Amino acid sequence: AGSIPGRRS
Amino acid sequence: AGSIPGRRS
Amino acid sequence: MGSMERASLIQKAKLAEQAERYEDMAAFMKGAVEKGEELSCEERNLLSVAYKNVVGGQRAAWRVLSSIEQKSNGPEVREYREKVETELQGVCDTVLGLLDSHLIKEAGDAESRVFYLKMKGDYYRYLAEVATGDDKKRIIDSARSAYQEAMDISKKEMPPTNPIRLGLALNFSVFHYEIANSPEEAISLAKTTFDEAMADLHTLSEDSYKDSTLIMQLLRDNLTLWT
Amino acid sequence: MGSMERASLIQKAKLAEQAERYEDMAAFMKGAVEKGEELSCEERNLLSVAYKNVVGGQRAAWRVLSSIEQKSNGPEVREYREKVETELQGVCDTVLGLLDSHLIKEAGDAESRVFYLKMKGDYYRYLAEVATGDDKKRIIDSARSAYQEAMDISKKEMPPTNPIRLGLALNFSVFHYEIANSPEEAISLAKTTFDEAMADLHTLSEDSYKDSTLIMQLLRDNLTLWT
Ligand SMILES: *Cc1ccc(C(=O)NCC2CCOCC2)cc1
Ligand SMILES: *Cc1ccc(C(=O)NCC2CCOCC2)cc1
Ligand SMILES: [Cl-]
Numbered sequence: 001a002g003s004i005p006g007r008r009s
Numbered sequence: 010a011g012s013i014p015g016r017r018s
Numbered sequence: 019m020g021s022m023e024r025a026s027l028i029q030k031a032k033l034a035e036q037a038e039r040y041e042d043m044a045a046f047m048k049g050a051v052e053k054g055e056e057l058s059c060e061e062r063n064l065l066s067v068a069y070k071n072v073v074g075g076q077r078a079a080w081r082v083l084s085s086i087e088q089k090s091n092g093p094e095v096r097e098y099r100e101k102v103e104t105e106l107q108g109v110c111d112t113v114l115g116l117l118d119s120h121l122i123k124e125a126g127d128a129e130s131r132v133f134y135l136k137m138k139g140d141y142y143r144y145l146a147e148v149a150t151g152d153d154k155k156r157i158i159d160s161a162r163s164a165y166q167e168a169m170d171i172s173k174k175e176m177p178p179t180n181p182i183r184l185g186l187a188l189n190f191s192v193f194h195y196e197i198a199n200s201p202e203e204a205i206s207l208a209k210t211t212f213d214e215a216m217a218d219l220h221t222l223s224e225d226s227y228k229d230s231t232l233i234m235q236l237l238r239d240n241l242t243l244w245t
Numbered sequence: 246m247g248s249m250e251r252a253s254l255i256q257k258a259k260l261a262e263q264a265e266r267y268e269d270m271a272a273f274m275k276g277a278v279e280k281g282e283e284l285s286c287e288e289r290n291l292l293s294v295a296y297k298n299v300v301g302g303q304r305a306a307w308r309v310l311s312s313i314e315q316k317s318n319g320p321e322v323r324e325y326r327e328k329v330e331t332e333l334q335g336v337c338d339t340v341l342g343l344l345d346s347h348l349i350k351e352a353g354d355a356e357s358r359v360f361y362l363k364m365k366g367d368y369y370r371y372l373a374e375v376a377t378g379d380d381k382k383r384i385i386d387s388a389r390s391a392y393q394e395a396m397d398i399s400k401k402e403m404p405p406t407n408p409i410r411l412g413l414a415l416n417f418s419v420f421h422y423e424i425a426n427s428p429e430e431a432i433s434l435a436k437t438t439f440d441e442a443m444a445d446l447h448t449l450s451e452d453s454y455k456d457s458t459l460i461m462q463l464l465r466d467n468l469t470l471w472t
Protein backbone atom coordinates (compact mmCIF):
# COMPACT_ATOMS: atom_id res chain seq x y z
CA ALA A 1 0.00 0.00 0.00
CA GLY A 2 1.65 3.19 -1.22
CA SER A 3 1.50 6.56 0.42
CA ILE A 4 2.54 9.65 -1.50
CA PRO A 5 6.19 9.02 -2.35
CA GLY A 6 6.95 12.69 -1.70
CA ARG A 7 10.70 12.11 -2.11
CA ARG A 8 11.34 14.46 -5.09
CA SER A 9 10.73 18.22 -4.86
CA ALA B 10 36.39 4.43 -15.35
CA GLY B 11 35.26 2.00 -12.67
CA SER B 12 37.13 1.11 -9.53
CA ILE B 13 36.11 -1.95 -7.53
CA PRO B 14 32.53 -1.21 -6.49
CA GLY B 15 33.22 -2.79 -3.10
CA ARG B 16 29.80 -1.74 -1.78
CA ARG B 17 28.37 -5.22 -0.99
CA SER B 18 29.99 -7.53 1.59
CA MET C 19 21.66 27.34 11.79
CA GLY C 20 21.04 30.57 13.64
CA SER C 21 23.91 32.44 12.02
CA MET C 22 23.02 31.61 8.39
CA GLU C 23 20.69 33.82 6.32
CA ARG C 24 17.23 32.41 5.61
CA ALA C 25 17.77 32.75 1.86
CA SER C 26 21.12 30.91 2.09
CA LEU C 27 19.48 28.07 4.05
CA ILE C 28 16.84 27.74 1.31
CA GLN C 29 19.47 27.83 -1.43
CA LYS C 30 21.54 25.17 0.36
CA ALA C 31 18.47 22.97 0.91
CA LYS C 32 17.98 22.96 -2.87
CA LEU C 33 21.64 22.08 -3.40
CA ALA C 34 21.43 19.28 -0.82
CA GLU C 35 18.42 17.87 -2.66
CA GLN C 36 20.44 17.83 -5.90
CA ALA C 37 23.30 16.08 -4.07
CA GLU C 38 20.88 13.62 -2.42
CA ARG C 39 22.10 14.81 1.00
CA TYR C 40 18.73 14.65 2.70
CA GLU C 41 19.95 14.93 6.30
CA ASP C 42 21.65 18.21 5.36
CA MET C 43 18.52 19.27 3.48
CA ALA C 44 16.39 18.66 6.58
CA ALA C 45 18.79 20.58 8.83
CA PHE C 46 18.82 23.55 6.45
CA MET C 47 15.00 23.58 6.22
CA LYS C 48 14.73 23.23 10.02
CA GLY C 49 16.95 26.31 10.27
CA ALA C 50 14.77 28.14 7.72
CA VAL C 51 11.59 27.37 9.68
CA GLU C 52 13.22 28.55 12.92
CA LYS C 53 13.77 31.96 11.34
CA GLY C 54 10.12 32.44 12.27
CA GLU C 55 8.68 33.58 8.92
CA GLU C 56 5.92 31.66 7.15
CA LEU C 57 6.99 29.33 4.32
CA SER C 58 6.10 29.74 0.64
CA CYS C 59 4.58 26.87 -1.38
CA GLU C 60 8.02 25.88 -2.73
CA GLU C 61 9.60 26.15 0.74
CA ARG C 62 6.90 23.91 2.23
CA ASN C 63 7.72 21.32 -0.44
CA LEU C 64 11.43 21.51 0.42
CA LEU C 65 10.70 20.95 4.12
CA SER C 66 8.42 18.01 3.34
CA VAL C 67 10.74 16.34 0.81
CA ALA C 68 13.72 16.62 3.15
CA TYR C 69 12.09 14.97 6.13
CA LYS C 70 10.19 12.39 4.05
CA ASN C 71 13.50 11.14 2.70
CA VAL C 72 15.18 11.09 6.14
CA VAL C 73 12.37 9.25 7.90
CA GLY C 74 11.85 7.12 4.79
CA GLY C 75 15.33 5.66 5.15
CA GLN C 76 14.80 5.17 8.89
CA ARG C 77 11.49 3.38 8.34
CA ALA C 78 13.04 1.08 5.75
CA ALA C 79 15.88 0.24 8.15
CA TRP C 80 13.48 -0.32 11.03
CA ARG C 81 11.41 -2.75 8.94
CA VAL C 82 14.53 -4.76 7.99
CA LEU C 83 15.60 -4.98 11.64
CA SER C 84 12.09 -5.67 12.98
CA SER C 85 11.82 -8.55 10.50
CA ILE C 86 15.16 -10.03 11.59
CA GLU C 87 14.11 -9.59 15.21
CA GLN C 88 10.83 -11.46 14.72
CA LYS C 89 12.61 -14.33 12.98
CA SER C 90 14.88 -14.68 16.02
CA ASN C 91 11.86 -14.90 18.37
CA GLY C 92 21.71 -12.34 21.94
CA PRO C 93 20.33 -8.85 22.63
CA GLU C 94 22.05 -7.25 19.64
CA VAL C 95 19.20 -7.31 17.11
CA ARG C 96 16.69 -5.88 19.59
CA GLU C 97 19.24 -3.31 20.80
CA TYR C 98 20.00 -2.11 17.28
CA ARG C 99 16.33 -2.02 16.25
CA GLU C 100 15.68 0.02 19.41
CA LYS C 101 18.48 2.44 18.44
CA VAL C 102 17.08 3.00 14.94
CA GLU C 103 13.57 3.24 16.39
CA THR C 104 14.67 5.92 18.86
CA GLU C 105 16.37 7.91 16.09
CA LEU C 106 13.23 7.69 13.94
CA GLN C 107 11.05 8.84 16.84
CA GLY C 108 13.41 11.76 17.36
CA VAL C 109 13.06 12.88 13.74
CA CYS C 110 9.26 12.58 13.90
CA ASP C 111 9.24 14.58 17.15
CA THR C 112 11.41 17.26 15.52
CA VAL C 113 9.03 17.66 12.57
CA LEU C 114 5.98 17.69 14.85
CA GLY C 115 7.75 20.30 16.95
CA LEU C 116 8.24 22.53 13.91
CA LEU C 117 4.56 22.20 12.98
CA ASP C 118 3.52 23.06 16.54
CA SER C 119 6.07 25.90 16.94
CA HIS C 120 4.72 27.62 14.98
CA LEU C 121 3.91 26.60 11.40
CA ILE C 122 0.32 25.44 11.88
CA LYS C 123 -0.92 28.27 14.07
CA GLU C 124 0.31 30.85 11.56
CA ALA C 125 -1.10 29.00 8.51
CA GLY C 126 -4.34 30.71 7.44
CA ASP C 127 -4.67 29.84 3.78
CA ALA C 128 -6.21 26.49 2.90
CA GLU C 129 -3.15 25.41 0.86
CA SER C 130 -0.74 25.93 3.74
CA ARG C 131 -2.98 24.77 6.58
CA VAL C 132 -4.01 21.53 4.82
CA PHE C 133 -0.37 20.89 3.89
CA TYR C 134 0.89 21.21 7.46
CA LEU C 135 -1.98 19.19 8.92
CA LYS C 136 -1.36 16.39 6.41
CA MET C 137 2.29 16.47 7.54
CA LYS C 138 1.15 16.24 11.17
CA GLY C 139 -0.98 13.20 10.35
CA ASP C 140 1.90 11.59 8.44
CA TYR C 141 4.50 11.98 11.21
CA TYR C 142 2.09 10.69 13.86
CA ARG C 143 1.40 7.78 11.48
CA TYR C 144 5.13 7.02 11.39
CA LEU C 145 5.21 7.13 15.20
CA ALA C 146 2.23 4.75 15.21
CA GLU C 147 4.06 2.27 12.94
CA VAL C 148 6.63 1.59 15.71
CA ALA C 149 4.37 2.19 18.73
CA THR C 150 3.36 -0.67 21.00
CA GLY C 151 2.87 0.37 24.63
CA ASP C 152 0.64 2.71 26.58
CA ASP C 153 0.48 5.42 23.91
CA LYS C 154 -0.14 3.57 20.64
CA LYS C 155 -3.84 4.40 20.86
CA ARG C 156 -3.20 8.05 21.68
CA ILE C 157 -0.68 8.31 18.84
CA ILE C 158 -3.17 6.81 16.38
CA ASP C 159 -5.86 9.23 17.52
CA SER C 160 -3.43 12.12 17.08
CA ALA C 161 -2.79 11.04 13.50
CA ARG C 162 -6.51 10.59 12.82
CA SER C 163 -7.39 13.99 14.27
CA ALA C 164 -4.81 15.84 12.15
CA TYR C 165 -5.87 14.04 8.97
CA GLN C 166 -9.54 14.66 9.74
CA GLU C 167 -9.09 18.39 10.27
CA ALA C 168 -7.12 18.56 7.00
CA MET C 169 -9.86 16.59 5.17
CA ASP C 170 -12.59 18.89 6.47
CA ILE C 171 -10.74 22.01 5.25
CA SER C 172 -9.77 20.48 1.89
CA LYS C 173 -13.33 19.44 1.11
CA LYS C 174 -14.56 22.97 1.87
CA GLU C 175 -11.76 24.99 0.26
CA MET C 176 -10.12 22.98 -2.52
CA PRO C 177 -11.32 21.41 -5.79
CA PRO C 178 -11.44 17.59 -5.85
CA THR C 179 -8.44 17.51 -8.23
CA ASN C 180 -6.14 19.62 -6.05
CA PRO C 181 -2.92 17.57 -5.63
CA ILE C 182 -2.61 18.38 -1.93
CA ARG C 183 -6.23 17.31 -1.40
CA LEU C 184 -5.59 14.10 -3.38
CA GLY C 185 -2.33 13.24 -1.61
CA LEU C 186 -3.98 13.90 1.74
CA ALA C 187 -6.82 11.52 0.89
CA LEU C 188 -4.31 8.94 -0.39
CA ASN C 189 -2.32 9.02 2.86
CA PHE C 190 -5.43 9.08 5.08
CA SER C 191 -6.63 5.97 3.22
CA VAL C 192 -3.26 4.33 3.90
CA PHE C 193 -3.68 5.32 7.55
CA HIS C 194 -7.09 3.60 7.60
CA TYR C 195 -5.76 0.45 5.95
CA GLU C 196 -2.38 0.04 7.61
CA ILE C 197 -2.76 1.67 11.04
CA ALA C 198 -6.44 1.86 12.03
CA ASN C 199 -7.44 -1.65 10.90
CA SER C 200 -10.25 -0.14 8.81
CA PRO C 201 -9.70 -1.51 5.30
CA GLU C 202 -13.30 -0.81 4.24
CA GLU C 203 -12.92 2.86 5.19
CA ALA C 204 -9.63 2.92 3.28
CA ILE C 205 -11.21 1.50 0.12
CA SER C 206 -14.28 3.75 0.36
CA LEU C 207 -12.17 6.88 0.79
CA ALA C 208 -9.85 6.00 -2.10
CA LYS C 209 -12.80 5.20 -4.39
CA THR C 210 -14.79 8.35 -3.59
CA THR C 211 -11.64 10.48 -3.90
CA PHE C 212 -10.82 8.95 -7.29
CA ASP C 213 -14.37 9.29 -8.65
CA GLU C 214 -14.80 12.90 -7.54
CA ALA C 215 -11.45 13.82 -9.06
CA MET C 216 -12.29 12.10 -12.34
CA ALA C 217 -15.46 14.19 -12.64
CA ASP C 218 -13.46 17.43 -12.14
CA LEU C 219 -10.66 16.71 -14.65
CA HIS C 220 -12.51 18.51 -17.45
CA THR C 221 -11.81 21.86 -15.70
CA LEU C 222 -8.00 21.53 -15.80
CA SER C 223 -5.21 22.65 -18.07
CA GLU C 224 -2.94 20.07 -19.67
CA ASP C 225 -0.29 20.49 -16.97
CA SER C 226 -2.76 20.39 -14.07
CA TYR C 227 -4.40 17.35 -15.66
CA LYS C 228 -1.02 15.60 -15.61
CA ASP C 229 -0.44 16.52 -11.94
CA SER C 230 -3.87 15.24 -10.82
CA THR C 231 -4.02 12.07 -12.92
CA LEU C 232 -0.59 11.04 -11.59
CA ILE C 233 -1.90 11.00 -8.02
CA MET C 234 -5.19 9.44 -9.06
CA GLN C 235 -3.15 6.54 -10.44
CA LEU C 236 -1.65 6.04 -6.98
CA LEU C 237 -5.16 5.82 -5.53
CA ARG C 238 -6.02 3.29 -8.25
CA ASP C 239 -2.89 1.23 -7.53
CA ASN C 240 -3.90 0.92 -3.87
CA LEU C 241 -7.46 -0.04 -4.78
CA THR C 242 -6.07 -2.76 -7.05
CA LEU C 243 -3.93 -4.05 -4.20
CA TRP C 244 -6.83 -3.88 -1.71
CA THR C 245 -9.60 -5.44 -3.82
CA MET D 246 32.05 2.14 21.14
CA GLY D 247 34.37 1.35 24.01
CA SER D 248 31.69 -0.23 26.18
CA MET D 249 30.33 -2.65 23.54
CA GLU D 250 31.75 -6.16 23.10
CA ARG D 251 33.84 -6.75 19.97
CA ALA D 252 31.56 -9.59 18.88
CA SER D 253 28.46 -7.40 19.33
CA LEU D 254 30.04 -4.64 17.23
CA ILE D 255 30.71 -7.18 14.45
CA GLN D 256 27.18 -8.56 14.68
CA LYS D 257 25.70 -5.05 14.55
CA ALA D 258 27.90 -4.10 11.57
CA LYS D 259 26.36 -7.03 9.69
CA LEU D 260 22.87 -5.91 10.69
CA ALA D 261 23.62 -2.33 9.61
CA GLU D 262 24.76 -3.63 6.22
CA GLN D 263 21.43 -5.47 5.83
CA ALA D 264 19.58 -2.28 6.79
CA GLU D 265 21.74 -0.18 4.43
CA ARG D 266 22.81 1.94 7.42
CA TYR D 267 26.39 2.41 6.30
CA GLU D 268 27.32 5.24 8.69
CA ASP D 269 26.32 2.98 11.59
CA MET D 270 28.20 0.09 9.96
CA ALA D 271 31.37 2.20 9.75
CA ALA D 272 31.07 3.33 13.37
CA PHE D 273 30.62 -0.25 14.57
CA MET D 274 33.62 -1.46 12.53
CA LYS D 275 35.70 1.50 13.77
CA GLY D 276 34.83 0.39 17.30
CA ALA D 277 35.80 -3.21 16.45
CA VAL D 278 39.19 -2.12 15.08
CA GLU D 279 39.83 -0.02 18.19
CA LYS D 280 39.49 -3.14 20.33
CA GLY D 281 43.07 -3.72 19.21
CA GLU D 282 42.83 -7.29 17.88
CA GLU D 283 43.66 -8.16 14.27
CA LEU D 284 40.71 -8.54 11.87
CA SER D 285 39.66 -11.75 10.13
CA CYS D 286 39.10 -11.90 6.35
CA GLU D 287 35.34 -11.38 6.80
CA GLU D 288 35.89 -8.55 9.31
CA ARG D 289 38.26 -6.78 6.90
CA ASN D 290 35.54 -6.95 4.25
CA LEU D 291 33.00 -5.44 6.66
CA LEU D 292 35.35 -2.55 7.47
CA SER D 293 36.03 -1.93 3.78
CA VAL D 294 32.39 -2.16 2.64
CA ALA D 295 31.23 0.20 5.38
CA TYR D 296 33.66 2.99 4.61
CA LYS D 297 33.45 2.53 0.82
CA ASN D 298 29.73 3.18 1.01
CA VAL D 299 30.11 6.20 3.32
CA VAL D 300 32.81 7.89 1.27
CA GLY D 301 31.07 6.76 -1.93
CA GLY D 302 28.03 8.85 -1.07
CA GLN D 303 30.25 11.79 -0.09
CA ARG D 304 32.20 11.60 -3.35
CA ALA D 305 28.99 11.50 -5.38
CA ALA D 306 27.68 14.56 -3.51
CA TRP D 307 30.96 16.40 -3.92
CA ARG D 308 30.93 15.79 -7.68
CA VAL D 309 27.37 17.15 -7.98
CA LEU D 310 28.31 20.28 -6.03
CA SER D 311 31.68 20.77 -7.76
CA SER D 312 29.85 20.63 -11.11
CA ILE D 313 27.30 23.23 -10.03
CA GLU D 314 30.13 25.37 -8.67
CA GLN D 315 32.05 25.29 -11.95
CA LYS D 316 28.94 26.23 -13.93
CA SER D 317 28.56 29.31 -11.71
CA ASN D 318 32.17 30.38 -12.41
CA GLY D 319 26.66 34.08 -3.92
CA PRO D 320 29.06 32.08 -1.74
CA GLU D 321 26.55 29.34 -0.95
CA VAL D 322 27.56 26.74 -3.55
CA ARG D 323 31.26 27.03 -2.71
CA GLU D 324 30.49 27.03 1.03
CA TYR D 325 28.37 23.88 0.79
CA ARG D 326 30.87 22.08 -1.47
CA GLU D 327 33.56 22.99 1.08
CA LYS D 328 31.43 21.53 3.89
CA VAL D 329 30.92 18.22 2.07
CA GLU D 330 34.60 18.22 1.08
CA THR D 331 35.68 18.69 4.70
CA GLU D 332 33.40 15.86 5.86
CA LEU D 333 34.80 13.57 3.15
CA GLN D 334 38.37 14.43 4.13
CA GLY D 335 37.49 13.65 7.73
CA VAL D 336 36.21 10.18 6.83
CA CYS D 337 39.32 9.48 4.72
CA ASP D 338 41.53 10.65 7.60
CA THR D 339 39.64 8.38 10.00
CA VAL D 340 40.18 5.30 7.81
CA LEU D 341 43.84 6.16 7.25
CA GLY D 342 44.18 6.59 11.00
CA LEU D 343 42.81 3.09 11.59
CA LEU D 344 45.24 1.62 9.06
CA ASP D 345 48.15 3.46 10.70
CA SER D 346 47.02 2.69 14.29
CA HIS D 347 47.58 -0.18 14.02
CA LEU D 348 46.13 -2.42 11.32
CA ILE D 349 49.00 -2.31 8.82
CA LYS D 350 51.89 -2.75 11.22
CA GLU D 351 50.29 -5.88 12.69
CA ALA D 352 49.38 -7.38 9.28
CA GLY D 353 51.93 -10.08 8.42
CA ASP D 354 50.09 -12.36 6.03
CA ALA D 355 49.99 -11.36 2.37
CA GLU D 356 46.16 -11.40 2.27
CA SER D 357 45.81 -8.94 5.13
CA ARG D 358 48.79 -6.72 4.34
CA VAL D 359 47.87 -6.30 0.65
CA PHE D 360 44.25 -5.63 1.64
CA TYR D 361 45.14 -2.84 4.06
CA LEU D 362 47.69 -1.28 1.71
CA LYS D 363 45.15 -1.26 -1.12
CA MET D 364 42.78 0.50 1.30
CA LYS D 365 45.51 3.04 2.11
CA GLY D 366 46.01 3.73 -1.60
CA ASP D 367 42.26 4.07 -2.14
CA TYR D 368 41.66 6.58 0.68
CA TYR D 369 44.64 8.70 -0.37
CA ARG D 370 43.21 8.54 -3.91
CA TYR D 371 39.91 9.93 -2.60
CA LEU D 372 41.83 12.71 -0.83
CA ALA D 373 43.64 13.39 -4.13
CA GLU D 374 40.32 13.72 -6.00
CA VAL D 375 39.47 16.87 -4.00
CA ALA D 376 43.01 18.15 -3.42
CA THR D 377 44.25 21.32 -5.07
CA GLY D 378 46.78 23.24 -2.99
CA ASP D 379 50.24 22.66 -1.56
CA ASP D 380 49.71 18.97 -0.78
CA LYS D 381 48.04 17.51 -3.88
CA LYS D 382 51.40 16.18 -5.07
CA ARG D 383 52.27 14.72 -1.68
CA ILE D 384 48.82 13.12 -1.42
CA ILE D 385 49.20 11.55 -4.87
CA ASP D 386 52.62 10.19 -3.96
CA SER D 387 51.19 8.74 -0.75
CA ALA D 388 48.53 6.91 -2.77
CA ARG D 389 51.10 5.70 -5.31
CA SER D 390 53.47 4.45 -2.61
CA ALA D 391 50.77 2.42 -0.83
CA TYR D 392 49.52 0.89 -4.08
CA GLN D 393 53.08 0.10 -5.17
CA GLU D 394 53.97 -1.69 -1.94
CA ALA D 395 50.73 -3.69 -2.22
CA MET D 396 51.50 -4.56 -5.88
CA ASP D 397 55.01 -5.74 -5.01
CA ILE D 398 53.70 -8.07 -2.26
CA SER D 399 50.78 -9.36 -4.35
CA LYS D 400 53.01 -10.25 -7.29
CA LYS D 401 55.35 -12.19 -4.97
CA GLU D 402 52.77 -13.88 -2.73
CA MET D 403 49.47 -14.27 -4.58
CA PRO D 404 48.35 -16.05 -7.76
CA PRO D 405 47.40 -13.78 -10.69
CA THR D 406 43.71 -14.69 -10.23
CA ASN D 407 43.52 -13.77 -6.54
CA PRO D 408 40.55 -11.33 -6.23
CA ILE D 409 42.42 -9.01 -3.88
CA ARG D 410 45.36 -8.91 -6.30
CA LEU D 411 42.97 -8.24 -9.21
CA GLY D 412 40.99 -5.53 -7.41
CA LEU D 413 44.23 -3.89 -6.33
CA ALA D 414 45.47 -3.81 -9.91
CA LEU D 415 42.09 -2.51 -11.09
CA ASN D 416 42.15 0.38 -8.61
CA PHE D 417 45.84 1.17 -9.21
CA SER D 418 45.04 1.38 -12.93
CA VAL D 419 42.20 3.79 -12.13
CA PHE D 420 44.68 5.78 -10.04
CA HIS D 421 47.03 5.97 -13.04
CA TYR D 422 44.26 7.03 -15.42
CA GLU D 423 42.25 9.42 -13.26
CA ILE D 424 44.75 10.86 -10.78
CA ALA D 425 48.31 10.50 -12.09
CA ASN D 426 47.61 11.55 -15.70
CA SER D 427 49.23 8.32 -16.92
CA PRO D 428 46.62 6.70 -19.17
CA GLU D 429 49.20 4.53 -20.95
CA GLU D 430 50.35 3.08 -17.62
CA ALA D 431 46.70 2.50 -16.72
CA ILE D 432 46.00 0.61 -19.94
CA SER D 433 49.22 -1.42 -19.74
CA LEU D 434 48.55 -2.46 -16.15
CA ALA D 435 44.94 -3.44 -16.86
CA LYS D 436 45.96 -5.44 -19.96
CA THR D 437 48.83 -7.31 -18.29
CA THR D 438 46.67 -8.01 -15.23
CA PHE D 439 43.86 -9.37 -17.40
CA ASP D 440 46.14 -11.53 -19.56
CA GLU D 441 48.03 -13.04 -16.62
CA ALA D 442 44.75 -13.85 -14.87
CA MET D 443 43.30 -15.44 -17.99
CA ALA D 444 46.29 -17.80 -18.20
CA ASP D 445 45.78 -18.89 -14.55
CA LEU D 446 42.02 -19.56 -14.73
CA HIS D 447 42.57 -23.24 -15.54
CA THR D 448 43.79 -23.81 -11.94
CA LEU D 449 40.54 -22.67 -10.28
CA SER D 450 37.39 -24.31 -8.99
CA GLU D 451 34.03 -23.30 -10.44
CA ASP D 452 33.37 -20.85 -7.60
CA SER D 453 36.85 -19.29 -7.69
CA TYR D 454 36.56 -19.04 -11.48
CA LYS D 455 33.36 -17.02 -11.02
CA ASP D 456 35.02 -14.71 -8.46
CA SER D 457 38.04 -14.01 -10.68
CA THR D 458 36.25 -13.65 -14.02
CA LEU D 459 33.86 -11.12 -12.46
CA ILE D 460 36.75 -8.80 -11.62
CA MET D 461 38.48 -9.49 -14.91
CA GLN D 462 35.34 -8.19 -16.61
CA LEU D 463 35.76 -4.90 -14.72
CA LEU D 464 39.31 -4.63 -16.07
CA ARG D 465 37.94 -5.33 -19.55
CA ASP D 466 35.21 -2.69 -19.17
CA ASN D 467 37.82 -0.05 -18.34
CA LEU D 468 40.01 -1.09 -21.27
CA THR D 469 36.99 -0.73 -23.55
CA LEU D 470 36.36 2.75 -22.19
CA TRP D 471 40.05 3.72 -22.48
CA THR D 472 40.81 2.38 -25.96
C1 LIG E 1 1.08 15.56 0.30
C2 LIG E 1 1.44 15.63 -1.18
C3 LIG E 1 0.46 15.85 -2.14
C4 LIG E 1 0.80 15.92 -3.48
C5 LIG E 1 2.13 15.79 -3.84
C6 LIG E 1 2.55 15.85 -5.30
O1 LIG E 1 1.94 16.47 -6.09
N1 LIG E 1 3.73 15.11 -5.65
C7 LIG E 1 4.25 15.05 -6.99
C8 LIG E 1 4.74 13.60 -7.01
C9 LIG E 1 5.80 13.38 -7.99
C10 LIG E 1 5.30 13.46 -9.43
O2 LIG E 1 3.93 12.98 -9.64
C11 LIG E 1 3.32 12.21 -8.56
C12 LIG E 1 3.58 12.71 -7.15
C13 LIG E 1 3.11 15.55 -2.89
C14 LIG E 1 2.77 15.49 -1.55
C1 LIG F 1 39.80 -4.63 -3.12
C2 LIG F 1 38.77 -5.68 -3.52
C3 LIG F 1 39.13 -6.79 -4.27
C4 LIG F 1 38.19 -7.73 -4.62
C5 LIG F 1 36.88 -7.57 -4.19
C6 LIG F 1 35.81 -8.57 -4.56
O1 LIG F 1 36.07 -9.71 -4.75
N1 LIG F 1 34.47 -8.06 -4.65
C7 LIG F 1 33.33 -8.88 -5.01
C8 LIG F 1 32.54 -7.88 -5.84
C9 LIG F 1 31.11 -8.19 -5.89
C10 LIG F 1 30.81 -9.44 -6.70
O2 LIG F 1 31.69 -9.67 -7.85
C11 LIG F 1 32.54 -8.55 -8.28
C12 LIG F 1 33.18 -7.74 -7.15
C13 LIG F 1 36.50 -6.45 -3.45
C14 LIG F 1 37.46 -5.52 -3.10
CL1 LIG G 1 23.01 -0.55 19.19
Ligand SMILES: [Cl-]
Nearest residue numbers: 030324325328
Ligand atom coordinates in the same frame (compact mmCIF):
# COMPACT_ATOMS: atom_id res chain seq x y z
CL1 LIG H 1 27.32 25.14 4.32
